[model samples]
Target: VDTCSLASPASVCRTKHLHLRCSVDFTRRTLTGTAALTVQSQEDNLRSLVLDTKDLTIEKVVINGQEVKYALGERQSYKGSPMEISLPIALSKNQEIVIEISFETSPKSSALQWLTPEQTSGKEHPYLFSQCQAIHCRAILPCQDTPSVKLTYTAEVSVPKELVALMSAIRDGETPDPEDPSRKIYKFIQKVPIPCYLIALVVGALESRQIGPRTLVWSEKEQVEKSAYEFSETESMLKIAEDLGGPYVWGQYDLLVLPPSFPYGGMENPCLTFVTPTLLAGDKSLSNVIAHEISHSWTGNLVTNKTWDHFWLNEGHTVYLERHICGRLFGEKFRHFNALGGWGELQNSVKTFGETHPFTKLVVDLTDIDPDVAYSSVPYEKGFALLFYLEQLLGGPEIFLGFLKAYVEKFSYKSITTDDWKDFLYSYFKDKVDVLNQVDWNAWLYSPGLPPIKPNYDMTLTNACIALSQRWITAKEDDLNSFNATDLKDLSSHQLNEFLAQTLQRAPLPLGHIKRMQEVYNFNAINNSEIRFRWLRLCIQSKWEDAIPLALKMATEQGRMKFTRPLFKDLAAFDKSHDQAVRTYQEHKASMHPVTAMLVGKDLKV
Candidate 1:
């Protein structure tokens, strides 16, 4: 065995031609692979060659098809190979050596967790899957797996008879069992070309819905229908994307919704994407998440960022494209509306420091302070803000969109760094618009927290508030009518629901005032979580007897985690009082979502 630490940059690692086969049983969470590598040795002093292996074993190493002695060691905590073999075998110039290896993996599910709702109309939980985050190269076949090293991968994966097996490429075959209805062996082969981290697979009780030319796979049947029914407009999204940018570069678009705790909001994996069940907007609106994922097809999947250090290339470009798509499909006002929502969310984010922390500073890479926080909102909100504001500075529509189209088309197939993007813009557009190049993209990428420029969103919000107050001052009985679908077009589902959130904190409105808001805002217009959630807040606070119908509507409808998360916080707050809140809990118990029930049953010391 020879030791090769991949810390230093090398022009190229000698390629060894190898053919391999692997089989995995998802129930057992174990995998095994066999391969033979023929290596052409380089360097005069080199004695023996070491093959990188994780927990997997090398069953045999041969010189001229003869077995040779080799030793293995633990490689995780340390950098060098644990096992070293003394090679009396000298490497003549241009000499080749063949090494045959076979290895097995620990139960993969033990390492990766996938979250899903049990039913489309059911509760959510985090379950186990073979999917790995970032560069989950280790979970598959172990090697020097990093984003920087681009490898042309070819492999076949076979799963048990119960679960479906999918790769970045199309499926190859399926083996169904005669005796067992629960499982089937699914085989997939990915030949196109990708790094290890981009590789992902899942096995469980799964189903898929056909949308457009693709099948939208879900962990459960109900989720498939719910997503399909709500996101039927996905075809429109894809079509709009084609007109704006080039057509979807990554073959067909398919969605795979994982169990509830599958980590990020969504990960765009070429042909098939992994999404969180939490993305399901009950009223059927998930345009934001949907568009965000779809944009990745051209941005990250095709024009990948070379390194994690240049992560802004992937996230930043995707965001710009997302806004562009929204603008085309929805309108310019919708685009501004989207930016304003980000601004509001970022503002709330800054309130965390209790006056000491500025929201702009939150934009920096403060991950060292708290990795979770940095990764969560700051990376998303701040990155989006920087790009949004840049669009504002770059002649608004014409310059911004033109530059974006140029950038995407130029870097479609190749990976690029942050500097690469800035340089490209500076070289071409800097002479005419020096401001574009002068603005430091690096400062936004490297510096911590939000940018220093104060967002100008206060005026619009203030006017909206004033208008609401005026409507309340002069209320009409007819004004209290339920919401209509037309009213929903004016604001985001989030904004529509957030209106109710703000209303609750204000002075109690007369029933006529509430009814006027109902009529004008059209709360009933949305048969979704946002409206129902606002009604819940109104009912629990106003305890309006008539609002009971809205409350019962909430009790009957499928709930969102965000809505349930806050409700329980309120419930617990009330639990300390030993008042009607307890009875309220008892009355709504059956209607509660599974997560809500489990949270209450486990906590709530009562």
Candidate 2:
């Protein structure tokens, strides 16, 4: 069960549990904390404990309440320094010890982000959050920062009394300091063992409301209502997911609608999921995001991938489950439409990585590189495609549903890899070994390109969309007057997105054609964010200058990298607006999450 993580030294001394006491300081933009790690020796000759750290100042190290000697290794480029603490005495296998370390995070800590009061929606108090995925956890707290290791944790966080503190763990209690009413201490306990990357925390002016008996939505006072409405189906989605898998092991499902700055659509952070405010689009067109994260409760939180290489085990299964849940709620054709969109995403990702790149493989290699660079839609889409193929290959829906439930039950509360998944599949279908053996496992799991087997989805609903886009293309070719807004009136918003995406893939439409389409359809006046984003991208591809402001507006209004990064890349491509793109990004970068800014910066080459 060795991790492919190049960041940690868990093979030496493995972390079993963690107790963290941290104070959030917005003034200094740092988190100073004491970590009491209960570690077990992995080897009989182990004489020292090595933990990963980055941009942190270590004040002291303690073993058994006695001061211990330690040395910080040279700072590495992306791996950070290893804090090597010398043991007073060597221990044998299964031997346990308690090591307490007091440390203060530096401003350069990559995992933590501190936002000033002005940066927040209410402008009442400063905000603080953490993004520890893919090894950034070491910067905030010294630990074995690898998904290969799972450990339960408890936390005591102190922040200004005006702001509440939250963590990925269950809320145990909170107490105000009697000596100073200006400050309070919040406590949480995560009984279920989780990897360090799943550890999360946020401190800011916040409010909450019960959306369901076991679900809550927390956000700034301004966004709580919209978020609540958007995620109102949480209880139902939870039941659907549990029906497909097993019971919901996580006690409750809560969502926090973070500022527009949150980088991802959502981070499935145990009980408390952190999401972007961009999902509050008034209409629930984007609530599939909720379903996706909820599916993670079983696919990812319960049975996780041991390393980043097999991340598809976590995401691919979740995407498959999400689509199933969506299809159940909507219809099978809707699921097919979604799958078609996903295929396009898969193609885009492969093209971005140059088709034969190693990263396009369902199971990738992250030997000495940061997992962030290797991240894309390939795993989610390709992995789902592979699973869908299996569902069809292994006697269709009834068989796959039973296997899906069994898969969760078998590996619940454990970390596994692609091989582990394959072994389980073979064991589950021992009677049908011949059928299972027919799978092209090597090509699907290791081949670096598009999936060998492409799924044939029911395109009945989307064919009209394709026809409409084709109609437009043929009209342009034949010099006919086919551009009309009424022609698009009957199409669903999903169909509109399909039409625009399909149209953008063709030769760029002329400026007059774009203008006519825009004025007739009034895409600029569209209320649905998803369709609007697609329209803006199409407008940009057609070289319509009017889209420049609209693109900037959407990028600044929403921080979802899905829309902002592409819009900025396309907007910056036009020589006339290259400076405009850079200026707009520089002006609004403060409103984006650190991860979003970093990714978009690479896109803009700023």
Candidate 3:
């Protein structure tokens, strides 16, 4: 079932109950720790246990409190190296033994990002955090850094006394450092077993505000209050999501607003979901990402993908259902309307990767391929469309939404692949086998550019958006005078973004149209990331040199890959800003997240 994983076959042994004793050392930008793992091997004679790691300095391996001989395998360019350990005695089959590996993370560890004091809002203390999705967790510790292995974890993290320390797990307690009084130790435990990638850590000068009974918004003093208000609707969203998926089992639902360099819009790291600071749209328009993260409590975190190749099972399912929550909170019209937006993005992804690229396929083959490079809106948007097509074909939202709930319950707490999801779909809907048989799986799951079928969306909300976009897209250079602010005055920000996106999908507007747009709309004063991002790209597409610095400033100010990557790509393609874009990337490259830096570096050829 695990085809693309580099981890050793778990048929012989499986890892569980990980105990991480680590310290956040900002001076060296490293995490020095001992990862104690409990494992059980069958077939009587176990000569070795191998784990995945990348660029970590392994100090020693000990079994039964005795040091064991170990060897680090040759490093791979992307999947990292394997750490193999040999015990003096073979343990009994099905009987678990605790093995401890002491290691130090490298300063260049892809999993960890260190921020200087100036990089933070407080500007008085440095910050540190981890992003370990797809395959980067190995650089954090020696473990089966694959989604195939799920385990409960306990972490004891020590950081400087002036800062607060946090993890994906709920906090147990904090005390003055026993080893170093200048520091404080924070204890955490994640009772619900999770894949290794969900184990995250963050430390900095942070403050927290209780937003709900079980929710806390944490960030620097400057952003804490705003974050609380931004996510004030989280409890309502969580309640609605729990109704759709299942009971919320992780207990606490907290959010942390990370510094600008945090890569993703929102990382569903179990109890504490990490979000980029850019989500503070002031109007809470971007809080749907909260629904996305909440849906992941069931989809991605609880029932995970077996390997990166089956990533759609985690993401596709969540996105489809996340909008379902949006349906409940907003309305069915909004659900299909937002679904329309996702289709637009899927089209953009197919165009970006080119329709022929393997990444455009639903289930990507990660053999010798980096999952990060394969990452795109394809799995997310295309996967959502696949589910959307099935829902409309087999049954409408009422019955299909029921199936989603059952799917979450059936596969809860287990890692699975697309086949598992497909098989269950048939099993759950055996009553509709007559109709399900007519569906084409290959065109939707494997032969991808976009899905073979897109649902007939509820165009009630988007009809006006499309009509407005048509006015701007079809306007003659002289007719641009007909466009005015009144055309957009009554539309919601979401609808405005859709209008801009529809316009962006067509050929680049004449530079004069963009010039009139800046003058008429005055989008320069608007800080809404979505509308601003779309507006910036359209100008760059028209080769308007005046938009260069404004677009570049938006790209660097906050590093959400969705906005930053394309902004930089268009900037590089614009002959006027190509050198400026490349030079800026080199200067700011160090401050960017490893994934953002690498992907953007590819865009600029530097």
Candidate 4:
């Protein structure tokens, strides 16, 4: 198979184990550390080892406790610089070697975000977190920054005594400095090997509560209880997933509810999953996000994508398992309803990229391009659609579930590619070649647009949602006044969100009509963030003045891209509210995760 990593020359030597000793300096906003990497020579007579780094200052290099010579290559966009550490002597094939590099991460490291005391909810202690997916890990530490490589790691992190430090690794114990009680050292160990992107660290004033026997929720002191309640069902979800696939190998499944600036909804780090606080709406409606992360235990942590190009192999299977858990918890129809919503999101993503864009394919090509640019709902939903199609073609879930169990069991603790998955599929269905032959493998795996086969989802639940949205489209201004809050009594939060989002793109309603709808339906004051975001989007598009303040509040309160980015864009489109949106962004920009701020700035052209 052709290798996909271009940043680091893993041919010379690939990493096997990593030992990190880092100090978190909140005042300086830097992490100074020595990364000791245990590597194995992949080829005979290899004279050098290449490592990936970005925005880092290399101070010294030690080869098995001896000083070594090294050269830093010219920097490349996104991929970062390659540290060519010259070996004292060439080694034969499969020769073991040890090298340690002492370095300091720059303040401008792309993977890190340092939030001042004012930016956090507690407003006392500073906070720091890492976002290292799709090649950002190079900026934080020198390593082979690719999903193709996996390594077990242990970290010793030092931080202020007032704060706590956490990593993806298992938490061992902490030691307070006897000489300087103001400082403390935290220790962790990751027995399971993971890709570079999964090496995470967060240091801040934190608190945690046990949500399940094997699960805990961590957040700032003020938000810990709310977070605990939101994820109380984590153990049940874990059990459902284990029954669906295999046993859970990761020891403890803990969650960290990060500050408002966390860019994505969730990052599935091993043992500890980092998520956004926006999910704490005081209700369990958003528990599916937690379920999605739990499903990643087997699909992503246990088995991984060989490269960012086969990212669907990581997310698609997890999504399938997430819906499976939802079905087991709720019912089969609920699972299809969730898929129907996902189909709409997938269609929107395809339209945004244009149907012919290559990124719409299930398996994308990311040779020189940053994988983040290609990231969207395409790989996620498109891949899920392909799997769903297979499930139907192979008769039903009985056969497909058996295949899934075998797939995960075979590839456990390893990374694989799209072809690898397909080969396994053919091998599993060897007895039923005719059924496999009916599938158009090329169109589903490599086609530029939507897959040819789309599932006929059970719309039993969503039919009322669509009907409500249609009523709003054709309802006259006089008829709009007749609609009341009780009209939505029968709909669940998910159904209400679906109704509002389905009608958002339709014909614009009059400003007065939109205002009355909000007043009667009371969408503006709902605790459900998902429903409120959709209502605000519709209000902004209709040029309703009352939504300006509400939009500003949401933009400042939460930094989730799904809600914040679109609201800012729509507010910027209106002449009267454009300046208000910009001002609100300027005031709250520091509170947003750097990635969120960057994207929102682009939307507002600030």
Candidate 5:
């Protein structure tokens, strides 16, 4: 039994593949279908099987043509409830059974978001998408939703004739439905065995433009052209990622620009990576997110995370490899510069969790906690820091890159925990075992705080940002003349963003200083969301009324909780605009993503 997951007996009888036959009913906002699970029993004479499910309506379970007995266990939040089904006959060792479960998803399925026409860019038709990472797959279907059970899947999703359907798998073909004139069936096949959390789906008036040999950019027609331009360099990142990791296993590396309400920056779903439209910065300054998602090809999609407890095994390595791709494409200093920003993000997240919180650890004890509850940058950034430190400690990029390739090759298409990953590190660096031995594994892995040691990242780029920010912070009365537009003219987009990020972390600058900053840098009119977001934050923190309404608008207009939450918090912290923040959020709350709305309310209340 999995502690954090209620997928009972998954350690004994695991799943092999899933054949999902479902029809999406937009009217009901539900997915009514059968999850034909191909399960393999490892132990001899396995009679009963248990699976994880939440807020789902199950009609029946069938094996070999006859309906089987199944009962739903107690229900609750987070871990949800378990469903145990009885087998008519005990199976021999290594035997397989095609267990068919007819089930329907709840309208309130945590994994799904049903958008109205007004919520979409085109405003012509509604859209449907699924985000099942962590444990939300159980909310969509009845199965062993735990990542420990990897399964290949084929899905036949029927949607309205006016709409198109897409899934995590590659599109096989589409066919007209004989039963209904207005609906059509879309078929997809994923040969690679992925955890159910990676099982994603989207249906809408979607259009696509072929950007590369194996890539297509999909979005509402309005953003399709811009998305194509934004992610045009996907193949470049794919090749760089391949040269560093192993060969790309997923055939296609397409990208789907989801509506603004998408909570996170990106969600890596095998062939189709879901990104928010905020990345549609006219320039490709934000294209690095594509590289980060592409690196997931080997780091996450191929080599899986066995349990949520080892989530860093997915995100940590993804960040490490993403930076590798960045270093290959841009200068190496750019890579370290981004890593420096990542460390700052880690510091803030650790502080948000009170630094002493267990969730800040590299490896956490998610015994009874939902992985979502413990989610933060600690795993992503601290994991990167540990790997980065080790990279410098053991040798350099050359040696560390060799181990990453080997790690992926060895664990390709399988799920594993931290022990397996840690053991492999020792085995790969067999010649340098002594160096790894000196590492304080317990402090790095189990301690509840920032990582034990930070790496000596190249500060050649970060130094510029810090120096500029300090000069601004410490500058007395009329030293304002010392700053000018030329102070930022030579910096790259990311470097400009780095300077803003550095300034944001320090004490609030005086209102006069921020006004001068605006006059010189003109960040008020900047289109890059990353830079604009920081600029607005700095202004709001300094009690600049000119930025209050803009900050409020930014919080609601883009539903990415990353920027939205802080903007709301800063608005609430200000003496005059506290009620304005609540008023603006209340007006836009209905249009916001569910997760964003919930957290924004809490941020304002606090």
Candidate 6:
């Protein structure tokens, strides 16, 4: 017997009417849903009705408002599902029935989990919120984990006094009873006409700093001031999102920075956005990620795509839109930086693991895509790059932007497929867009391949070579750096890494610019990402024990978490092999007034 089948399983049960009542405990991390459901059918021959449950207990079931006997069977493979509670009522196709379910959650650690300190340590916070899809939701509610069906729920959650609870709608301002300071029941009334997957809620120990109109930044008590400090651009970001998305349909927006282990940069939940700790770019500098999440207000959160298959419809559009939004706020140069970073990430990733076929991968067909790397580059890089390319091919941004705006207006709060985007493109550009259809868009969309270079390859290559050569020479030399006239006759891959490493940071470059370009341009950026990735391997290698600290420094920035924050932490491990006397001296000093090392568990040299 497949235990998972007996678990939370889902099947459309023919019930004319269904009602459920559940109580949630914030402290214990358990839920007790007691529901009374009724159903009636035209014919008197029925098998069962679909009930949403995972580990719930049915207190009673009534057919035509009368108690009835039923058989319980493990709906094969539903190891933990209570969704297919077999009522086995005798009725016809159109039937009316009633059933009641009352159940309690397992425990706090067992039920709902939140982002941990490691994720929120101001380093990489996105992972923490991304885990929300798996870690926390299982704790929130129990149902068949599917996105097709929408449900009307009336949930009364009992949360601890110190924690502020927010759900579907705005919170009703009734405080907990003074006698029972430990708990309070928060109720919301938004008949969430959404799939079970879309229903989201977060509980945490945090403090809030208000933004304009009705926005707030929530973070740990220690970060209350710092988060506010980091969120100086919150108001502008919110306003820009509103203007682009046509106002925040979800009500007052808030930012929640979980402890460092959040696992992802940001989650665009309705009102509460859980961002990775890394997003807090000390002094409020990381605006690109903020704009990206904000752009989701429409493309992802407000107007969600139907299935995970069409995720690019959400992410791709968000990235393209955010560039414009960010440009409006930060200026033209920053926009260039933003797009450059995106293309760099994509090119780097594709070079590393992307399919070799030169074509755009359709948003829906991602069969050959590596699921492990999917979260990192595919959605962000390929999605954004292809969309941007499409924008360019569509005769500039205005027409493309208009198409998206019109598409969003047409399919807001619903699901759309790649076909829709294709039809839209074809209708607008006619021959032009149709010509693109012949350019193997199918190969690009369905297969994990990069798009082919346009016909003007020679000119592009020449310019790129010149630019890279100039960069190398300018970055390396202080005086008499003839980068423009240098001719690179010969250089190997090893020499390119060495040359760039040696010359970019110093002066008096030796290699000619032309030869340097020839050598470096052919050397893949994806290969560089891999070589850089090996630093961790090298640092951890038992032979080169001393290099640990250096690797960590290259990986992360202790002050402000950036792209490679994890690597810097590896250096702290060098202390492990210190001489006995040195260890004693360090221990003595640490004991005098000890402080915890933030990069725990890694080989970071203190």
Highest-scoring model, TM-score: 3
Please write out the lDDT profile of model 1 over residues 1-606, one tens digit for every residue.
Answer: 111232211122332344445665444546666554444555555575444344444565555656777676565432323434345577665566655556666542222433333422334321335444343444344444334434443445555454456655566677654444454555555444454456666655567778776546555655777777656666777887666667665567777776543445577776777776656666546566677888887777667666544555677667767777777876776666666666655555554433334224422332222122223345456667777767777666577667777777887656676667777776557665568755665556555444666444324433453444445445565654533435446555656655664565553556556655565565655555545665565644443445554453443343334454444444445333224445655665554432344344444444
How much does candidate 4 score in TM-score?
A: 0.96
Q: Summing lDDT over every window of 10 consecutive residues in candidate 1, give the lowest-scoring window.
A: 1-10
Overall lDDT per candidate, in order of appearance: 0.55, 0.85, 0.89, 0.86, 0.87, 0.49
Question: How would you order the candidates by lDDT, starting with the best?
Answer: 3, 5, 4, 2, 1, 6
| Model 5, runs deviating above 4 Å | none
Query: Candidate 6, TM-score vs. the true structure?
Result: 0.66
Better of 2 and 6 by TM-score: 2
lDDT of 3 by residue, 1-606 (tens): 354445666676788799999898999999998999998776477878778889899999888879999998888787788788887788667878899999999988999889999999988999998999978898899888889889999999999999999999989999999899999999999999899999999999999999999999999999998899999989999998888887999999999999988999999998999999989999899988988998999999989998889898988989987898888888999998899999999998899788888899998888878888888888898889888888998878888889989999998889988899999999999999888887788888888586777788989999999998888877898798888888888899999899889999984888888899889888787788899999899999988889999999999988999899999999999999999999999999988888889999987889
Clash pairs, model 5 backbone = none
**Top lDDT: which candidate number?**
3
Regions more than 4 Å wrong, model 3: 1-5
TM-score of 3: 0.99
Please give the distance, in angstroms, between residue 378's alpha carbon in candidate 5 and its true position after superposition: 1.1
TM-score of each: 0.68, 0.96, 0.99, 0.96, 0.97, 0.66
User: How many clashes show up per model?
Assistant: 31, 0, 0, 1, 0, 98
For every candidate structure, what is the RMSD over all alpha carbons to the true structure, in angstroms? 7.8, 1.9, 1.1, 1.8, 1.5, 10.1
* RMSD, candidate 2, Å: 1.9
Query: Native-vs-model 1 lDDT?
Result: 0.55
Local lDDT at 119 for model 1? 27
> Please, what are the lDDT tens digits per residue for candidate 6 over residues 1-606?
111122222233322222434444543435556544444443445565444343444555554556555444453221233454455456665555555545564543222343333434343221111122321233334343333223444445555655555553455464574445676666654433443444445555556888657678777676777777776677787787666556566666777766543434666665666675565545455556677777876787656654456667778888888887877885655555556555545654566454663223445333443221233455666677666777666666666777677767876655556777667667767768555665557654666655554211113222343445356556543533444323334532322333443332232234343233334443323233323433233333222444445444334322222223233332333344334323332443221111112222112333
Candidate 4 structure quality by residue, lDDT tens digits, 1-606: 223343445556678899999999877889998999988898988888778889899999999678999988887776778888889889898898878899999887879999999889899999999999878888899898887778999988889998999999899999986646789999999998888889999999999999888888999999898898888889999999999888988899999999987878899999999998888878888888988999998898888888888999999998999999998999999999998888888887787788999998888878776676566888889988888889988878878989989999999888899989989999998997799999999999888887888987999989999998888788888788778888898998889988987888673677877877877887877868788888888998898887889887886777778888888988998888998889888887765666677678867889
